[PDB]
Amino acid sequence: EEKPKGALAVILVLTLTILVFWLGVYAVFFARG
Amino acid sequence: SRVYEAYPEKKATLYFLVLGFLALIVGSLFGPFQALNYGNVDAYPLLKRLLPFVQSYYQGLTLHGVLNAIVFTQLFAQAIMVYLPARELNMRPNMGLMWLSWWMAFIGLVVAALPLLANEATVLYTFYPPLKGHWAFYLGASVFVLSTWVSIYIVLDLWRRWKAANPGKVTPLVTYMAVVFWLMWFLASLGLVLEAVLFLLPWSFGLVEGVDPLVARTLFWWTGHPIVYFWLLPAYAIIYTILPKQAGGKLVSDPMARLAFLLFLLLSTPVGFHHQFADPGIDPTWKMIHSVLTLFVAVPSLMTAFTVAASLEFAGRLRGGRGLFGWIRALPWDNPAFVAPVLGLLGFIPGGAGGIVNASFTLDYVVHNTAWVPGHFHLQVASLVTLTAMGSLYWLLPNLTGKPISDAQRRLGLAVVWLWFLGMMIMAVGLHWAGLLNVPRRAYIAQVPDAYPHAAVPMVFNVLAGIVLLVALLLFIYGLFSVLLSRERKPELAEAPLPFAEVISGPEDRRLVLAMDRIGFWFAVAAILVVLAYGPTLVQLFGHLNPVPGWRLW
Amino acid sequence: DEHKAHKAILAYEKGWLAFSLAMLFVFIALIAYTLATHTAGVIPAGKLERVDPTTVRQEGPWADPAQAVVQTGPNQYTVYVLAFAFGYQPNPIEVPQGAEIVFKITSPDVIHGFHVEGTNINVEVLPGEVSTVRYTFKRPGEYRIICNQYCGLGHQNMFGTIVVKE
Ligand code: HAS
Ligand code: HEM
Ligand code: CUA
Ligand SMILES: [Cu+2]
Ligand SMILES: [Xe]
Ligand SMILES: [Xe]
Numbered sequence A: 001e002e003k004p005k006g007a008l009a010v011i012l013v014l015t016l017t018i019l020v021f022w023l024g025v026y027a028v029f030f031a032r033g
Numbered sequence B: 001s002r003v004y005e006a007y008p009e010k011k012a013t014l015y016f017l018v019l020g021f022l023a024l025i026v027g028s029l030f031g032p033f034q035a036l037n038y039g040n041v042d043a044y045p046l047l048k049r050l051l052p053f054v055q056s057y058y059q060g061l062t063l064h065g066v067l068n069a070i071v072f073t074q075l076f077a078q079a080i081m082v083y084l085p086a087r088e089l090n091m092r093p094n095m096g097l098m099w100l101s102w103w104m105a106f107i108g109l110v111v112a113a114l115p116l117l118a119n120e121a122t123v124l125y126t127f128y129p130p131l132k133g134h135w136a137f138y139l140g141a142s143v144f145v146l147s148t149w150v151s152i153y154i155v156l157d158l159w160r161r162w163k164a165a166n167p168g169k170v171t172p173l174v175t176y177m178a179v180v181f182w183l184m185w186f187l188a189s190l191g192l193v194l195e196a197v198l199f200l201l202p203w204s205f206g207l208v209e210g211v212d213p214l215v216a217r218t219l220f221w222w223t224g225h226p227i228v229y230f231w232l233l234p235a236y237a238i239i240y241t242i243l244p245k246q247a248g249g250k251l252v253s254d255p256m257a258r259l260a261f262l263l264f265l266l267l268s269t270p271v272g273f274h275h276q277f278a279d280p281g282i283d284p285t286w287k288m289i290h291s292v293l294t295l296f297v298a299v300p301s302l303m304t305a306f307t308v309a310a311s312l313e314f315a316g317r318l319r320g321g322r323g324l325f326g327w328i329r330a331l332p333w334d335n336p337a338f339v340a341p342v343l344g345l346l347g348f349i350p351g352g353a354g355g356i357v358n359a360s361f362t363l364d365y366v367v368h369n370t371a372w373v374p375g376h377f378h379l380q381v382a383s384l385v386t387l388t389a390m391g392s393l394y395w396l397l398p399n400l401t402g403k404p405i406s407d408a409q410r411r412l413g414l415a416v417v418w419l420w421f422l423g424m425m426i427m428a429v430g431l432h433w434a435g436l437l438n439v440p441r442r443a444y445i446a447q448v449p450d451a452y453p454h455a456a457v458p459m460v461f462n463v464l465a466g467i468v469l470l471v472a473l474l475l476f477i478y479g480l481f482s483v484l485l486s487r488e489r490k491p492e493l494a495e496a497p498l499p500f501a502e503v504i505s506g507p508e509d510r511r512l513v514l515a516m517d518r519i520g521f522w523f524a525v526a527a528i529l530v531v532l533a534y535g536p537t538l539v540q541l542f543g544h545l546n547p548v549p550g551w552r553l554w
Numbered sequence C: 001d002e003h004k005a006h007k008a009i010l011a012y013e014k015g016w017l018a019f020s021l022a023m024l025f026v027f028i029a030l031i032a033y034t035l036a037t038h039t040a041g042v043i044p045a046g047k048l049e050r051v052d053p054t055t056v057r058q059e060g061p062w063a064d065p066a067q068a069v070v071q072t073g074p075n076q077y078t079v080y081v082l083a084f085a086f087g088y089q090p091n092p093i094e095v096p097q098g099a100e101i102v103f104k105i106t107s108p109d110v111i112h113g114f115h116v117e118g119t120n121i122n123v124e125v126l127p128g129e130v131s132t133v134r135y136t137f138k139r140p141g142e143y144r145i146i147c148n149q150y151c152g153l154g155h156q157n158m159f160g161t162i163v164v165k166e
């Protein structure tokens, strides 16, 4: 029909869930450095 | 059955299935207890009164590990990644061999089960040396695994045969996947084949007295990582080519799926060092090179994320899907075989987030050997792979036995499904928290209740889950056996063609798929990558072998 | 419709993948950043250091607990730690904060884990191999070592102690 609004909203949660995890633990690495 | 005479593969497949699920049941019983244990409660007395032969926490973990992650998965894959390509091709697999593969799997399990049930094998599913297990464990497992080799032949045989009857034709989708899959698994299984053949088997038979534990865990992980994808891809297979039909839609691209699988064939094996970050005697550089390749092997699962979402979206739209989120509510939430996997994919997002972190080299040092890792993978294997397995019963079981499913079983499953997912969610939260709270995994920490007081609140989630999933497992069993135990037989639905998805193709596709169908080239490509990543390391290691004597610590 | 979607999806898939790889290459450089710093010490030494596991606490740097701590630089202190069947040697380790502690850990029996709670020291201790990690404590106290690798039935009870010096 048009732009995959649903799928791009899914990959959003994903990429955000990725950054939370990766930045969230990337700081604990330096906080235990 | 003229059904089985006309489709003997059906029978072989079924045996694989049941055996697998049987294995999943038994291995799953210890799961609630291991959850309660991680909630700081020690339910193991009760376990021991019920199951007398159980001697400790660690024997039940081994059994948990082995039956669930190893036996169950392998059997399923062997069932899916052979039956599906067969039916797609409408060709019969070499049945001598196929039946041979099953017995091997059966026999292998039996022989390996005994020393596990006899507390002769309390080593864990990883069986790291110098911890020494009974020969019949290492001989049992070897057989069982080798069973896959047969499966690899069988599938390749089919493939060669079909290419003959269709000269110049692109390999059909599922068959392409299965092909890459098994090749990929062949390459992956070497690592383990070596370990067992060179060290473990002669070690356990008496022939040597020592085995280098580093070279042992190096070879193990050569195989140890790709096997997780050996577990995954059969579910991926189903999600790509079967779920979209279930959802009322189509696969949105044949090339994309081919690509995903192609990347796995290339990037699955040469990443094992990610499991060995905390290890000594392995260059940090090669640990960086492997950390890069691991972030790369996540690309395939990134592609899948989109491709499947779009298809599911597409599906919801054809159903009467509203706005940004309508399509979702348009989906068949009444159909298990739809619900099960979709839930798994949800939990996968956290799972795969967990894996990207574990793969970032230095960041591993925060969570290694902690209960964060069981949290990571229970989303992966115990959630997505298992649910998928479960839900696929609803089209598969009927397609094999002819036994239709009553509406009551159909809702029974929907309950099993939700509980299992929910419980998986709770625990996921309860093992991730305590993980960052330095609680180590593989631990009977309910025998030391005051060791970890800062994990107060997560210990609760673990408890909850334990219960949740204890119920879910029960109902499954009941739901499971209700189906297999009924004498309703509709020999027409057994003959019903498998509900494969239709595939939206494009103009560009042709030349791209044509490239990908260069399998013999990609295989050697994949073979070269492993040599380049392991080669260097393994040479020095076999130059400086320092075998140490075996220990029994149970 | 259906063929219209196909080119729409395969067009944001191309833009999703570009973004994906850019995002991963930012992780690579933010991993390539932690490799040039002082934090990159807790990485086990790459060069092989073979030892016998059956004559470690009889002859050599791990025989005598007392000689565990040894100044080897102006502000460097090479500890020789010995991860064994449910326990650590020396217990407790005693080293000054602000100093560069270069641990050299092995085992006489099976594999052990050397996890210092609150730090980045997390290394696998292998029989017949020396596990060599560099670290600088910048906080005082009693640091707890946990054995994160299943080493038998007394594995959940194997803990250590590093009293850094205040
Ligand atoms: C099948 C089971 C498994 C999968 C899959 C898996 C995936 C990964 N793993 Fe892993 N793993 C590691 C890295 C990864 C990475 C980078 C990935 C990647 O493949 C993951 C990429 C996945 C994604 C990036 C997510 C894609 C999400 C999708 C596709 C879902 C979208 C959902 C939709 C679209 C639904 C929407 C629908 C609606 C209705 C809204 C590392 C580190 O590098 C360790 C070592 C940790 C340690 O030190 O012990 C590790 C450890 C393990 C262990 C412990 C083994 C042991 O006993 O010692 C197991 C069993 C395991 C299994 C599995 N693992 N892993
Ligand atoms: C009945 C539901 C289940 C529950 C409540 C459960 C719970 C747990 C818990 C709490 C652990 C951590 C044990 C520890 O660190 O000491 C664990 C380990 C594990 N689980 Fe499960 N589990 C379940 C089913 C499954 C399934 C279906 C699979 C995969 C097919 C699986 C695979 C594994 C593996 C491979 C381990 C690690 C074993 C080891 O380290 O030796 N589990 N489980
Ligand atoms: Cu060393 Cu547990
Ligand atoms: Cu892995
Ligand atoms: Xe097995
Ligand atoms: Xe084995």
Ligand SMILES: [Xe]
Binding pocket: B224, B225, B227, B228
């Ligand atoms: Xe594994």
